[PDB]
Amino acid sequence: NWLGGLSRAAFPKRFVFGTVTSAYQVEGMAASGGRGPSIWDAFAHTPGNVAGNQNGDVATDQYHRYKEDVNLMKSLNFDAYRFSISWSRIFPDGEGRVNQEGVAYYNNLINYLLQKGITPYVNLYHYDLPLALEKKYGGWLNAKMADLFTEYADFCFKTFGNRVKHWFTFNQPRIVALLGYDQGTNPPKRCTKCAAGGNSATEPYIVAHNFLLSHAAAVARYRTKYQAAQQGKVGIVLDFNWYEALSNSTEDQAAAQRARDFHIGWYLDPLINGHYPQIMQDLVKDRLPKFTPEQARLVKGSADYIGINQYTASYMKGQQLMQQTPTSYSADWQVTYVFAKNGKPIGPQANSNWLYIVPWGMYGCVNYIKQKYGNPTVVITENGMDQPANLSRDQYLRDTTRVHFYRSYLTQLKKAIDEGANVAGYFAWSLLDNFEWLSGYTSKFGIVYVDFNTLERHPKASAYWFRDMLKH
């Protein structure tokens, strides 16, 4: 059977299923309704930055259509919806004056969700730093971001927190650090060679440190001011792809473990244990900022749950560790990526070149966190795959590969949960085809097809798969 034995009965009582979007990727009205620009508006409006010179000005127009989209998610039997608030739609300059029209939108969206029995899971930040803060403060390079972010979070808690009980601060700070400040391919386009300036060896570490301090400060504000009355939770969303040793050699096993530590441990060791991974301290040395005892104690235990975005897996090959002139965060790991073993690829690729379909990576990641970090409450906050550009509507709708993807990945998630992993929920990326950052509209991740000419929504086979799997 096409469900392959999956249903709500196959998961724990009260396990949460949802779909996910992010503000810039779906809302549209990017320069309307009082919204100020983000670093993504500026970046996407520069010729050559995004596929087809596309941008999120209109995107899926969820701003106008949100009731349609909520009706659709309810009809597909989801329990929850993860979306983000655009900082610059609330505070067009990132601080100071509140855009009341922006506030009204999120009130309307949250209220409709609740009216329809869909639980809002709300991200405060999803790459979309207000342009004004980038220009005035230097963005995430500036330790002052902790104060600026805390003040924004405080406003959101006060304004929405009587209704919203599930918050996330950040989405994938690793990718902000990597793409914004190591490779310089996402805004602010910083790197050692980059026109904007930068230093691929130092800035990714400064940026990560500031995300951690900002998360901790926002959570401290929630707990001391709002939580007694509101009784909600705040976590963080971190990407984690699985790393498997290419062989059972000491060097390959060490390499895979180094990759895990530089990828997820970078954030989870501070959040769970109050320090960076030992290997990162050993290899990165004075380029890795030091938490004071007070900061470390603020960061430790500051996530009520850990969101994990899980997509893919790689093999890892290792080498003797060597003294080397620092060049970048990526090069600091001293590992070699490998995508085949015994002459067989680890899995076929989706439309995105980085996205290898490897369902057992889901089990890898979930098991690893359970065993290493004392089984923290985890929520799978994104999982999904993409179709390419230029298909016909019907080809988009017959998304047989995506159906297989969800059945296989969720089977592997079920295996990990059945072995005792503390996973509380699962969210599909994405509800809708949307603006996929550098890929623009050339990458289709949705379980619902969006015709980008007419803006019409049409559920794909994977949407109906979820509907069948999730019927109550």
Ligand SMILES: OC[C@H]1O[C@@H](O[C@H]2[C@H](O)[C@@H](O)[C@H](O[C@H]3[C@H](O)[C@@H](O)[C@H](O[C@H]4[C@H](O)[C@@H](O)[C@H](O[C@H]5[C@H](O)[C@@H](O)[C@H](O)O[C@@H]5CO)O[C@@H]4CO)O[C@@H]3CO)O[C@@H]2CO)[C@H](O)[C@@H](O)[C@@H]1O
């Ligand atoms: O995209 C859907 C949805 O997901 C969330 O964010 C995504 C994000 O959009 C993607 O950009 C990001 O992609 C990263 C991959 O997950 C990650 O595996 C990949 O790793 C690179 C690595 O950075 C790179 O150094 C490495 O290069 C090696 C070469 O492969 C070798 O041949 C060469 O010899 O050596 C170099 C380095 O030693 O390769 C791998 C790629 O295979 O990096 C990607 C970024 O480039 O994934 C995110 C999720 O993990 C987001 O929430 C949503 O908004 C978004 O729409």
Ligand SMILES: [Zn+2]
């Ligand atoms: Zn519209």
